[PDB]
Amino acid sequence: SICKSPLLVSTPLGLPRCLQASNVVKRLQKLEDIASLNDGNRAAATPGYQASVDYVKQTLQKAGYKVSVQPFPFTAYYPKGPGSLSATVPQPVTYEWEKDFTYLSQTEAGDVTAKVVPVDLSLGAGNTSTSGCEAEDFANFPAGSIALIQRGTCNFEQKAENAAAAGAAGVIIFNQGNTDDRKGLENVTVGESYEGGIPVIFATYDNGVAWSQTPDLQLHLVVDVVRKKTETYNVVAETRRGNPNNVVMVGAHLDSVFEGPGINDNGSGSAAQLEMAVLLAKALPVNKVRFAWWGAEEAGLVGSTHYVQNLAPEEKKKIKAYLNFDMIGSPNFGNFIYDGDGSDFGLQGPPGSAAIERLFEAYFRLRGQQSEGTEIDFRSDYAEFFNSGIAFGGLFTGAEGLKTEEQAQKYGGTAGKAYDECYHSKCDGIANINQDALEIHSDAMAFVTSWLSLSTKVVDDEIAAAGQ
Amino acid sequence: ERWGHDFIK
Ligand SMILES: C[As](C)(=O)[O-]
Ligand code: NA
Ligand code: NA
Ligand code: NA
Ligand code: NA
Ligand code: NA
Ligand code: NA
Ligand SMILES: [Zn+2]
Ligand SMILES: [Zn+2]
Ligand SMILES: [Zn+2]
Ligand SMILES: [Zn+2]
Ligand SMILES: [Zn+2]
């Protein structure tokens, strides 16, 4: 019960001592058990996610928190099988699923055969295509056709909804082809908010070129997915103690992809944060600490975005800093700190993000541990905080990227293998957790959260300097 | 530009 003392859990070198990786692992086992009892996933709008919410809520209530379970409307998307695409005119041709074409995430289902009509294309190296970005691009578009649209300038959602409003029966978006690396298939989405009502697929650039030059082309397009208008939930709790006008917020999404239990992504962040919150119940913070477990992150940051957008302006101004923990137990981990200062990738967070990054950096360095930057281009639940000008930072142990030889020297593990080879897969279970990674990153989570709970001055100083 | 896992444009 020594870690029930406020003297330990209130201070930045005390909280990490009391936040033990073995206790995070026990919570990870519980999430694993939950997934196993609910068909192997904890995905948004599933019983696995609901049972994860119940677990987090009950844990927080037993620690003395009041808990807000915040519902929001949500259109779930599930691909139910591979797509089909074949030419019927002028000649029969069968294109290959996941080589010539793929789904847009959040597309509607459909089965359509129709003439293919290119819309305002701009081909070739160095093009700046605006294909389909304006309703006027469809000036000569015949209703019922398949719109053949080039990637470029505006969102896929906008291209597809413009085509739908112009009466398209379906949409084929092909990669832009302005550089050699923008000619293949990619992970692309029309967004959870897509409402075009028609199917949308993505195709390679060279296929787009050939189709756009094929007189009388007709394509038979089949998209086998389900979208379901439903709801899901964020879980939010805050300390009773601490200044309510200077809130330190920490977040970790609680949903998994549909394909697996999501123990590293993001059981790891969820369980470390839950352990910290339980310990902080006894702390004496100067600044209020708010904890969020986000829903529907894997569908496009839906829960965290909804939370921020729905905050009254006066309440939004009270959040001084946001810390995001999304994947911190990677089997082949590296020590990645969000690149708030843009020193590695050229994107700066809102004023104060450099200070948060610097706090993480100094903590790893003090411990003789290596670290390096990772990108912050709206990849996780800080995104809407970023858009709202709120300072943020975070920790990451790596996902599908391949470990370099240097990083294996710095962090151990295997060069040329993914940081997490079970990323978004059935095998992302309890066995997919590296407890050294959990130890190192839950330590730093606790240190920086505790530090800011006592003083946000490092953040305040950058805010002040930015104002002049 | 990303918004989470996927490119939105
Ligand atoms: C695709 As992700 C931001 O849940 O690692
Ligand atoms: Na929605
Ligand atoms: Na068909
Ligand atoms: Na245009
Ligand atoms: Na829309
Ligand atoms: Na070597
Ligand atoms: Na994706
Ligand atoms: Zn089943
Ligand atoms: Zn217009
Ligand atoms: Zn994640
Ligand atoms: Zn993920
Ligand atoms: Zn940096």
Residue numbers in the entry:
A (entry chain B): 44 to 511
B (entry chain P): 3 to 11
Authors' account:
Here we investigated the aminopeptidase, P. aeruginosa aminopeptidase (PaAP) from P. aeruginosa, which is highly abundant in the biofilm matrix. We confirmed that post-translational processing was required for activation and PaAP is a promiscuous aminopeptidase acting on unstructured regions of peptides and proteins. PaAP contains an M28 Zn peptidase domain (residues 44–116 and 274–510) and a PA domain (residues 117–273).
Guided by the structure of PaAP, we designed a cyclic peptide (cyclic-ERWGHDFIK) cyclized via an isopeptide bond between the glutamate and lysine side chains. Cyclic-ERWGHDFIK was a potent inhibitor of PaAP with a KI of 22.8 nM, which is ~440-fold lower than the linear peptide. Moreover, cyclic-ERWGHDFIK was not degraded when incubated overnight with PaAP. The structure of PaAP_T in complex with cyclic-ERWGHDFIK (PaAP_T(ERWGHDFIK)) was solved to confirm enzyme–inhibitor interactions. The structure of PaAP_T(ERWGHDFIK) is comparable to the structure of full-length PaAP, adopting the same closed/inactive conformation (RMSD = 0.3610 Å over 934 residues). Cyclic-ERWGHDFIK was predictably bound in the groove between the PA and peptidase domain, almost identical to the C-terminus bound in the full-length structure. Complete electron density was visible for the inhibitor, including the side chain linkage between K and E, which is shown in the omit map in Supplementary Fig. 6c. The inhibitor complex structure suggests inhibitor binding induces a conformational change, stabilizing the closed conformation and blocking access to the active site. Inhibition showed no time dependence, pointing toward this conformational change being a single-step process.
